[PDB]
Design a protein around this ligand. Sequence first.
Ligand SMILES: CC(C)(COP(=O)(O)OP(=O)(O)OC[C@H]1O[C@@H](n2cnc3c(N)ncnc32)[C@H](O)[C@@H]1OP(=O)(O)O)[C@@H](O)C(=O)NCCC(=O)NCCCC(N)=O
Ligand SMILES: CC(C)(COP(=O)(O)OP(=O)(O)OC[C@H]1O[C@@H](n2cnc3c(N)ncnc32)[C@H](O)[C@@H]1OP(=O)(O)O)[C@@H](O)C(=O)NCCC(=O)NCCCC(N)=O
Ligand SMILES: O=C([O-])CC(=O)C(=O)O
Ligand SMILES: O=C([O-])CC(=O)C(=O)O
Lengths: 435, 435
Amino acid sequence: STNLKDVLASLIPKEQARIKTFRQQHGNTAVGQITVDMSYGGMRGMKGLIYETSVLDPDEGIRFRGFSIPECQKLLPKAGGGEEPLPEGLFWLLVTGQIPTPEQVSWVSKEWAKRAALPSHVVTMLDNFPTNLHPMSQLSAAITALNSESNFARAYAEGINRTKYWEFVYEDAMDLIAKLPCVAAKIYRNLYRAGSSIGAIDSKLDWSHNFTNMLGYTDPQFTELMRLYLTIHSDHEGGNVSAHTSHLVGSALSDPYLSFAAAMNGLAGPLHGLANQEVLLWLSQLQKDLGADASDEKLRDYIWNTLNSGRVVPGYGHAVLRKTDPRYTCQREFALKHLPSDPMFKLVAQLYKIVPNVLLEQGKAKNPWPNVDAHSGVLLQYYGMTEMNYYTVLFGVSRALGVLAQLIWSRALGFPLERPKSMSTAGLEKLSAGG
Amino acid sequence: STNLKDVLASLIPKEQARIKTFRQQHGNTAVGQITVDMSYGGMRGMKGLIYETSVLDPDEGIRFRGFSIPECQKLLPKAGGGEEPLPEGLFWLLVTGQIPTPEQVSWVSKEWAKRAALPSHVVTMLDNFPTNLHPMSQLSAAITALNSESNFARAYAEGINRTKYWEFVYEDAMDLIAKLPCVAAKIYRNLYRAGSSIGAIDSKLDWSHNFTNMLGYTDPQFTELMRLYLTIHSDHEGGNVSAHTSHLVGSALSDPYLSFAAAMNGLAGPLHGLANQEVLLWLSQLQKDLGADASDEKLRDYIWNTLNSGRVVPGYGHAVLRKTDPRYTCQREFALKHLPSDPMFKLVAQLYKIVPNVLLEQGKAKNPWPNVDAHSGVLLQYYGMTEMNYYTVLFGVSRALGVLAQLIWSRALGFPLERPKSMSTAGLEKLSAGG
Ligand SMILES: CC(C)(COP(=O)(O)OP(=O)(O)OC[C@H]1O[C@@H](n2cnc3c(N)ncnc32)[C@H](O)[C@@H]1OP(=O)(O)O)[C@@H](O)C(=O)NCCC(=O)NCCCC(N)=O
Ligand SMILES: CC(C)(COP(=O)(O)OP(=O)(O)OC[C@H]1O[C@@H](n2cnc3c(N)ncnc32)[C@H](O)[C@@H]1OP(=O)(O)O)[C@@H](O)C(=O)NCCC(=O)NCCCC(N)=O
Ligand SMILES: O=C([O-])CC(=O)C(=O)O
Ligand SMILES: O=C([O-])CC(=O)C(=O)O
């Protein structure tokens, strides 16, 4: 009855035509200009990609297919007795552009439970990895190793016509999303619960709930946090490091497994997703140096030392946002409702009153406001997940939803190889005159 | 006496200033414009990155720090009694911009022999991988797993000042290049020479020669081919999928190991480096269907069928070149000197007279000429390396030289996070009016 694949089959040809015509009329229209500073500056401010699933406004933050976070909270189906949106529903919205029904949502949940299964070579590999290998590296290696199972890789090798690429990318996408929590939970248990098992999938629960059970958490509020977490970290337009990496690698026709693993190596960067872990380590040194209940003057001193030592203050600033991240707000709000008296929370709250000011005073950051990473780990710590080197893995699990939803569309729309032109400083000087 | 690290220490501050001033004067100068078609077209034709090591001219092909392939052949140091350039020398040129002395070259060779050593967890992992796991996937997973050894990851975690990033990236770069051939050779032996050992590094040989010995090849001409192969596949400006992926991931501060593994997942794409393998599989079906000595009319038919089935003809076309790739020419020339009567070579030569014509007739490809991938495997097959699913691994090994040479410079120059702005079709329509 419900079948996302049949819905996409109808949607595809219509978008194809729409884009065709628009390009007929405006393909040559100029949308911007490229300056020397932009090339030197990591393409800052260059409109360079088409990415359909979400769009980020510098002032307002993220919109998923046109809806803001509050809107999603309000419109997406929730679990029975739940308050937080189910990520299954978000996935539906990203892929189709339509708010799903609860019936649609449960189908997604069953599909994902049905496809969750790991091959033994992956299991062995994880089980044989050393404990000093970072969780993200263990994750990226496992997903890379899962490509032996790719249906897209296989169909390509069989010579399938390019028009059908999307159908195979869709299947690998749904298989990958299904498997992710098992890989992630296996890493968690091996490293932190040595000798225990992740157990089995219950085809009757939502994806978030089977994940938390594999992680070994019983608290129902924890289940709720995970639903919210997994929904909000899902996508953030196409230019962010991880989504752009998946997009660029996927453009070459590498399979979804290879494309997502590469993305993961981009998310593990300190300036990207690893910031969530970096925030907790910075907070821990803080409370350690200064000891728990600090004065404002002492916090400022602490921030200045970081700055003066040639380092960044993690969880603050953004390449495109210019105001406080609604993802940060959304987390604050969860904390105020559920763990208002937590001391770490209280510390994060205090920093909100100080860090921006210090950053403004320094005068280098364009955006002195916090980003999602400044508020995430604090919530996780409260429930007992104190292993901070594992936090980025949660972000990776969520990010699969967004990048994979777009990957289907990239192939459906026939986007070609991403291949811009590069320049040397010497060549660029000549192009202009020099300086 | 020779110490690349000391040479870079002098070079860095001077480039830093040069770029500073130029940007002072021309930062706001416009170098191009962005159109709708470019955003939809994988940034085709957009000048979007600064990449110092090599620059590609659409007509003339690649230049490494200003030198063309023939120039390199002629200027770079060769092995005693050799004719082909040593890749060690190319690495020196890319990193410093200067042609090295043979003495400099040997230092590079010793450094690389000294640093070649694998940790046991990597060894185990490879040894436990299944034979149906693609060689590239085995490679990318191993490099990802090697990050436990990253000196950059470690220094970052210790809070090093951003000004010293390059020094740690340099060390991981030289360690990674050193280790690559051992990882690659281990994959080769496990898959195709089960029960044998790669053996040991001889600190007295060039990198290419220790690699071929680990692969188990004795032919001296094979050693020569490998030197040439590894030199020519080294770099191809910054916008190619693999180099751009390494650049983008590295921009987030992920370590060289993570950045190169991600690049490898991009090189494994059929539209990128896997084309080398794809060419040999296409040639094998050819000679199989048509049987060895084909008529021109039969070859055309064969090409048309591929085209008509919604597939690409591998080894032809390019995102930026508009003429025959000098890398292809350079290989042809090697074949004419060493294996002129090889039947497969003869087939490749015949296709040169037909494929372009067919592509032009079809009218879709912008560049109907061959690229490097159309001539590489044929040479490898001649010497006995007939395992075509492993060819891309050789390309990866070579590509480390270029991307890693630039990675050092990216951090030395303080390039920031690569983060362009994306757009949805709907948002873009509105920006203009629609169509
Ligand atoms: C996120 C980001 C990399 C954005 O980079 P950008 O767009 O290049 O930032 P920008 O235009 O404000 O940078 C201007 C200057 O301010 C500095 N600055 C910016 N944010 C800073 C921060 N939090 N702490 C210290 N310095 C900072 C920049 O590093 C740069 O200095 P430089 O000229 O000497 O290089 C940056 O704000 C940063 O480094 N933040 C800290 C790391 C972090 O929290 N990352 C997580 C982002 C969210 C996510 N998960 O991806
Ligand atoms: C290399 C490349 C992806 C360049 O892509 P591009 O810059 O998008 O190519 P383009 O502007 O000529 O494409 C225009 C049209 O011609 C088609 N075309 C281009 N090269 C083709 C080829 N070899 N066979 C069939 N069709 C081809 C394109 O796929 C496209 O058709 P579409 O409009 O229906 O999408 C393309 O030429 C190709 O697919 N080649 C075959 C694969 C290959 O040899 N890759 C190796 C490249 C070298 C390397 N190692 O990276
Ligand atoms: O938008 C970006 O550049 C980074 C970010 O916050 C995300 O990827 O979630
Ligand atoms: O230049 C490109 O886009 C691809 C290519 O030939 C290479 O990476 O060697």
